[PDB]
Amino acid sequence: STGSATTTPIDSLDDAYITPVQIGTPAQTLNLDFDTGSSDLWVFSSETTASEVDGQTIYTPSKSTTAKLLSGATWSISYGDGSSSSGDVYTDTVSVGGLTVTGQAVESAKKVSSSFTEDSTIDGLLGLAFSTLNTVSPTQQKTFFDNAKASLDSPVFTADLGYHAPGTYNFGFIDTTAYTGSITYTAVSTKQGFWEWTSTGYAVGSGTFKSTSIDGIADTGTTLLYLPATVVSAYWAQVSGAKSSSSVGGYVFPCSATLPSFTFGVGSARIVIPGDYIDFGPISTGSSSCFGGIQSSAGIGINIFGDVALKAAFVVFNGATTPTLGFASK
Structure with a gap:
């Protein structure tokens, strides 16, 4: 079926x-x-x-x-x-x-x-x-x-x-019509009950790719992308006027900005999140401060590849005896 x-x-x-x-x-x-x-x-x-x-x-x-x-x-x-x-x-x-x-x-x-x-x-x-x-x-x-x-x-x-x-x-x-190129599969740990995997790194905009292991979960029920504070700081440093606001509860940026893309690694493959995916609009109605779609995981205890990341890909949740995740561009 x-x-x-x-x-x-x-x-x-x-x-x-x-x-x-x-x-x-x-x-x-x-x-x-x-x-x-x-x-x-x-x-x-x-x-x-x-x-x-x-x-x-x-x-x-x-x-x-x-x-x-x-x-x-x-x-x-x-x-x-x-x-x-x-x-x-x-x-x-x-x-x-x-x-x-x-x-x-x-x-x-x-x-x-x-x-x-x-x-x-x-x-x-x-x-x-x-x-x-x-x-x-x-x-x-x-x-x-x-x-x-x-x-x-x-x-x-x-x-x-x-x-x-x-x-x-x-x-x-x-559905082999739903994605471009090939699907890259990556290992999953089920030890915490999640679709937990390890990204191979990231890039900000047109910057060089940083090879680094980022363990996190593929979570369709989370809106945003939550990553380590180092990675998140590196991203928002490329947006003039972006800052972390303790009053708002995360990174905000000027609504006048054009956001850079964010790339994450899946094995040797790369998924690019366009900058517009990272714009979550005014913090309050009519504000010129906009809420960012990449936020620090430091206060969570896990990194979360939420919808901001997943909607940039075609994502396979492979529930075979040894589960795996697959990611393709689309």
């Missing part, structure tokens, strides 16, 4: 991407944030505290003939940005882009944090990291990918995120 679904930016900045997902029978279509940095499929639901729902589409298990309570199971998750959610669990039929899994754990939110409530465009998350990070207790549950894997033509999914445009998530096949 295969599946193929379009993923669409939630706003003009590409802050996140939503993908329609069919849950239940008859289908209830919810727009989920596919997150390669977490492992829970959770949804706004008929159980979510009413004051915490503001425009999201909800899953109503009682209206699904295939829903079954997963008795005793609860979940609770906290994300890198400080957001959180928790609740109970149903199993149901879940389809993405024509690919169906029966018996998928669908984590029904009873509570969500303010950032989720305030984002009316995101109806929940679909985790695509390794199932070792799934938070369901007392019986950990599998991701949609892990449940689908054995049925897929190839045990892979791909992320092809657009810059200010829709893109695609494919499951079970590699």
Whole structure:
């Protein structure tokens, strides 16, 4: 089997991407944030505290003939940005882009944090990291990918995120029309439950490439590119008037600037992030200070190749017995 679904930016900045997902029978279509940095499929639901729902589409298990309570199971998750959610669990039929899994754990939110409530465009998350990070207790549950894997033509999914445009998530096949050149594969560590890999270095603009190992995660659920402070300082030093603002919470730059590109290494290959991908616009409406899309990881504990980096590539998440990542230009 295969599946193929379009993923669409939630706003003009590409802050996140939503993908329609069919849950239940008859289908209830919810727009989920596919997150390669977490492992829970959770949804706004008929159980979510009413004051915490503001425009999201909800899953109503009682209206699904295939829903079954997963008795005793609860979940609770906290994300890198400080957001959180928790609740109970149903199993149901879940389809993405024509690919169906029966018996998928669908984590029904009873509570969500303010950032989720305030984002009316995101109806929940679909985790695509390794199932070792799934938070369901007392019986950990599998991701949609892990449940689908054995049925897929190839045990892979791909992320092809657009810059200010829709893109695609494919499951079970590699669309050889979707990228240019060849795909460079690189090793993955699953020790922390993430798609963790080591970049071979970076360049700023037309500068020389610096060979240096940068361990980090491929995380579709993170907007920005978070890298070591040395690398980030080297980038923003090439932008007149850029500075790190403790009041704003990262590097800002004059909205009048033209940003340089940023290149990262994948083995001997190179992925170039155009400068415009690094512009996240005014810090507040009407400001002439703009927020940068490359930020320091120093206060995180991990480097994160988030959407700023991933949308410059066609990215293969190879879930074979020995997982690997692949990157191609496009």
